[PDB]
Amino acid sequence: EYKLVVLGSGGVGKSALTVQFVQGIFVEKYDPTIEDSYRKQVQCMLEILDTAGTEQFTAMRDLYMKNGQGFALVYSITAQSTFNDLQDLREQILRVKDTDDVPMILVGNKCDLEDERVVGKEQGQNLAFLESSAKSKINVNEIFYDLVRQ
Amino acid sequence: MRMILRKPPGQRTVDDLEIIYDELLHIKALSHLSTTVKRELAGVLIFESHAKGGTVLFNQGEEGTSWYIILKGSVNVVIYGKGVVCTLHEGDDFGKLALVNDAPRAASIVLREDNCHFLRVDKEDFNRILRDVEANTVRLKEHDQDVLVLEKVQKYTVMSGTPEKILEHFLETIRLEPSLNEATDSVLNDFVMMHCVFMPNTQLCPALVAHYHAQPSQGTEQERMDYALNNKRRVIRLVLQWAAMYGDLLQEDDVAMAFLEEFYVSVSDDARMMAAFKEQLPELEKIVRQPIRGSDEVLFKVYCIDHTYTTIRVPVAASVKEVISAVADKLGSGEGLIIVKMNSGGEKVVLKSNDVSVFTTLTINGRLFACPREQFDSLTPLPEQEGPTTGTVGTFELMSSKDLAYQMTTYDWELFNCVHELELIYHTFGRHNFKKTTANLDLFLRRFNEIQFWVVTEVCLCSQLSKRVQLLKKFIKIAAHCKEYKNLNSFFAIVMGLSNVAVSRLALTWEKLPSKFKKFYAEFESLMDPSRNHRAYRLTAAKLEPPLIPFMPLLIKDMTFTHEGNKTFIDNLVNFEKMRMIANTARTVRYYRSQPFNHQDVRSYVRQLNVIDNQRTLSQMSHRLEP
Ligand SMILES: Nc1ncnc2c1nc(SCc1ccc(F)cc1)n2[C@@H]1O[C@@H]2CO[P@](=O)(S)O[C@H]2[C@H]1O
Ligand SMILES: Nc1ncnc2c1nc(SCc1ccc(F)cc1)n2[C@@H]1O[C@@H]2CO[P@](=O)(S)O[C@H]2[C@H]1O
What we know:
The complex is a heterodimer.
Chain A: E1 2-7, H1 14-22, E2 39-41, E3 45-50, H2 58-67, E4 70-76, H3 80-84, H4 86-96, E5 104-109, H5 122-126, E6 129-130, H6 140-149
Parallel strand pairs in A: 1-3, 1-4, 4-5, 5-6
Antiparallel strand pairs in A: 2-3
Chain B: H1 2-6, H2 14-24, H3 35-41, E1 46-50, E2 56-58, E3 66-72, E4 75-79, E5 83-88, E6 93-94, H4 96-101, E7 108-111, E8 116-122, H5 123-129, E9 138-142, E10 145-152, E11 156-161, H6 163-172, H7 181-198, H8 201-212, H9 221-246, H10 254-274, H11 280-287, E12 297-303, E13 309-315, H12 320-331, E14 338-342, E15 348-350, E16 367-371, H13 393-396, H14 401-417, H15 421-429, H16 439-460, H17 465-484, H18 488-499, H19 501-504, H20 507-512, H21 515-526, H22 531-543, H23 552-565, E17 569-570, E18 573-575, H24 576-592, H25 600-606, H26 615-625
Antiparallel strand pairs in B: 1-8, 2-7, 3-6, 3-8, 4-5, 4-7, 9-10, 10-11, 11-18, 12-13, 14-15, 14-16, 17-18
Helix pairs in contact in B: 6-7, 7-9, 7-24, 8-10, 9-11, 14-17, 15-24, 16-18, 17-18, 23-24
Subcellular location (chain B): Cytoplasm; Membrane
Protein name (chain B): Rap guanine nucleotide exchange factor 4
Keywords (chain B): cAMP, cAMP-binding, Cytoplasm, Exocytosis, Guanine-nucleotide releasing factor, Membrane, Nucleotide-binding, Repeat
């Protein structure tokens, strides 16, 4: 039993990465109301706790942070503001569970589209760094692999 | 061979049956079936021949009594108002859909050429032999393209299709018999609710008029008269379901109001001229905290950088561009303004020109700003945003735990019933795609945060440790009463308020709380377990009977993931499977509100909460209460 959390601002691709990992878009219909909606056995069982659609309710992310063990700080490489929103979420993790060190990974989603890219690869490297793409299936599984190892 | 297949089922010999079976092995329409099934079909399959081109096999609207396979020649699929929609050839099969769904024929089948041979299986023979086994996808085609796709999910249900065909399908399958009033409405409900996504009123209303005036292209005078009359009865029925779904929201739509007013005129004129619609006409005559409407006007303050404000008077559903325009009018400017939301914590979001009805999407203490882009980084919060500096314990402590929870649930129900079902659809798919308000949903969702931060505010403003222990006790009791009243939303809001970092930090307060309430709260926290898709909550809500307020953030999550997890279109066709799932989640809300809910000073307090929503401020207050 493992519990991983996906964090970031809206329009980043959190939900797209979550579905694409647990089941996959299109190939099967996605029902988010059943028991195994966010659980995937990969050997170990992983539950993905995603803040997508509930960002306005800060209590939801805190509850997820409390129950979380691995964390994914995701941003869009086409959005300047989204990279700047990551600093606060990083701090908030080390407050709810009251710890010193926490297993986490930084994620740069939407790496497929370059003619709209305003955020380079360099910036995320200084702060685990991955340039993933939910729709192009790039590095989708890799994100959740690092967290179980840590 | 032909003679053998022309013989009645009960007149076929053992040797006849063997010869027929050997022939069935060469027919490709049957190749996916088992030996067992094909042996049974050998004594049931009827050979049918017709010599003349233009001979009618069956007509649109008739009962589905047979399933056909083409041995030789070709047939035209003919639909009223469309002509020959497509052609079927040697090896193709037709007529399954009406047979299995017990629905009328959606088309006529007419021979394309001279001398056509068919294999036929009649209804009762099809249902005992082929019903479960012959599970081929039903694909209705127009212009060599799929137009409707149906599968066994036992009837074939719509999986995908064009808006026009989906509408045609749901119109034709309406059963007008009074004993099926509930069953008919349930089938129609998905389309009626979800059409705004794939077939907006601008398209639907003209389609309804056209369908209402559609005339059959086949049959005797009486037969044609009867079909057209029942067709009209079906359209009226759909219009009634359509109008009921909108309710008061029709006033927001000029096209829909114009359609309905003219539709009533049409139906009333036809009723008096044909002596028909005696039950439906009076029903149609009826239609021709209070919920906020998109056309309602608001006096809204939009702030300048120096903290002066412009008061604008615009519709609730106004776009950001319309807001910018209204601001620019009163300030007398034409110098590139942008609209930005600002938190009490200084967090800023630039609103897009496209966004509609933003007034109610602000955080509890959020404010709206208008500034040139150069000013964005220099903006700073207003004092009025930072919340109260003194508590209100001296007021609500004198109020009963039961009285507070009851007045909360009462107020919550007024807000919950103000939310229209369609607002859930608009919120999920994006307000800009509809240019509609979700103001009622917005304010009800903000209520969850208001209650949460009320808890944190009062605790953090309570200097005396002894009285602070009395607060934790009281909030736990208010939560318990809320849970009893089936207000699970406000219940989780208080619990999460107690779970807040600034409140959970106060060890000296929690320690001094009696173990009776320590265990009560720990039980509440376990109900919040996100494990197995919030199984603890889901089972709790499932056990409860109708009049209940659900955990709203999880409802918004379900909807979000239904939309993002599923494509709206599959092969350029409407993914109706997705439409059903969204509709089911909205019907869950309808179920929760299907039954009604059963001290002015307590009412006044509960409805006028003044709250801190700045987390930094709350943490700082907490750190000086208990270092
Ligand atoms: N079973 C049918 N269901 C619907 N339409 C039929 C059907 N059969 C026909 S053909 C009528 C006909 C047959 C033989 C003949 F010598 C003269 C006329 N039609 C004609 O084919 C036309 C195709 O275009 P529409 O505007 S739907 O009108 C249709 C009818 O006039
Ligand atoms: N657009 C349509 N609307 C209504 N009916 C259509 C339609 N298209 C068809 S046949 C489609 C098809 C065409 C070529 C092919 F190889 C396989 C299938 N049909 C066939 O015509 C029958 C009319 O009676 P049903 O019991 S509703 O079953 C229908 C289908 O088998």
